[PDB]
Design a protein around this ligand. Structure first.
Ligand SMILES: [Zn+2]
Ligand SMILES: [Zn+2]
Lengths: 189, 193
């Protein structure tokens, strides 16, 4: 299995290339997708983008499970509108917001080990693209799944969350629960 | 007992520190804070420290760049960064202002963000007014790397960290420091001067 690439590796900070839709069913692409799913599940994390394993292609994978959700308190899950969703593979995803509704919560990324920051995201999105088999799909998502989609689509354009985080919120994982500083907007929606 | 460096997340790093009463700078209490900062800075080791980084909500900075520290860096880097040794400096209630519009771009780290670096644009030339550790009124004129350190440390006193003013797509682990800059990133260096 490929290792998750850390911030600084140019592949993370460069625009990923579209996959030829007719090649999605190929050995080469299926292997990249298989590797991404295994890497994601090994971390474990709820989302991964191809550049994170050193592959400059427009591919994301994502899932949120009863198990992952069980590691957070009910009150946080409720606030974050965080709900299970089946494994999703999107090739050449194109994301657009469904409304102007936004929420602010702490995010992390496997390519930035040991830190989190508060990131404003759209609450409702639509993402078009291709599935694992090369069939055209349209995904409508809200709440936490929508945030995951934006985070992972961002990686395809060489964009990390640290370059669009709310000022004065960046923090170590151990400091996650400390108050927000004077003047910071409050978490939630 | 020597204080530990406070890490990003603790509100003392992210809020505005208060001035020291000038008449109190010479007191044992403030001297102790300053001695603690110096020991913590040298322990890391690093070239600058601000009081909020040891959990003290006061406007005090210390900084030091020794011939020894500088001996480790590449000759070409030292030249580009205009990085020259300077003796231990303490300023209380510093007030920083630029002396020209000339800027430079290089990588910075902060002990309060362990394990990462990013490229940050700074003024090449600054002047800082304030008090020394005995409470005497002073002015400090700096350029190159010393000017950068002054800006970074003064920023801490207003609850500002480099990560909120870094060039996009340059944030990186220390181990990846030397990897190439991605396309569209500005090159490291300085305006002609
Ligand atoms: Zn990520
Ligand atoms: Zn610092």
């Amino acid at each position: 299995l490929p290792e998750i690439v850390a911030s600084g590796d140019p592949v993370l900070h460069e625009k990923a290339r579209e996959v030829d839709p007719g090649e999605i069913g190929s050995e080469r692409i299926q292997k990249i997708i298989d590797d991404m799913i295994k890497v994601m599940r090994l971390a474990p994390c709820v989302g991964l983008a191809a550049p994170q394993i050193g592959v400059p292609l427009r591919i994301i994978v994502l899932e949120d499970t009863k198990e992952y959700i069980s590691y957070a308190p009910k009150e946080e899950i409720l606030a974050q509108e965080r709900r299970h969703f089946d494994l999703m593979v999107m090739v050449n995803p194109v994301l657009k917001e469904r409304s102007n509704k936004k929420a602010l919560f702490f995010e992390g990324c496997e390519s930035v080990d040991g830190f989190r920051a508060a990131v404003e995201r759209y609450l409702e999105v639509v993402v078009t693209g291709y599935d694992r088999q090369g069939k055209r799909i349209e995904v409508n998502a809200s709440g936490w799944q929508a945030r995951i989609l934006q985070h992972e689509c961002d990686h395809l354009d060489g964009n990390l969350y640290v370059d669009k985080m709310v000022p004065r919120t960046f923090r170590t994982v151990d400091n996650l629960d400390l108050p927000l500083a004077e003047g910071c907007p409050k978490l939630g929606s």
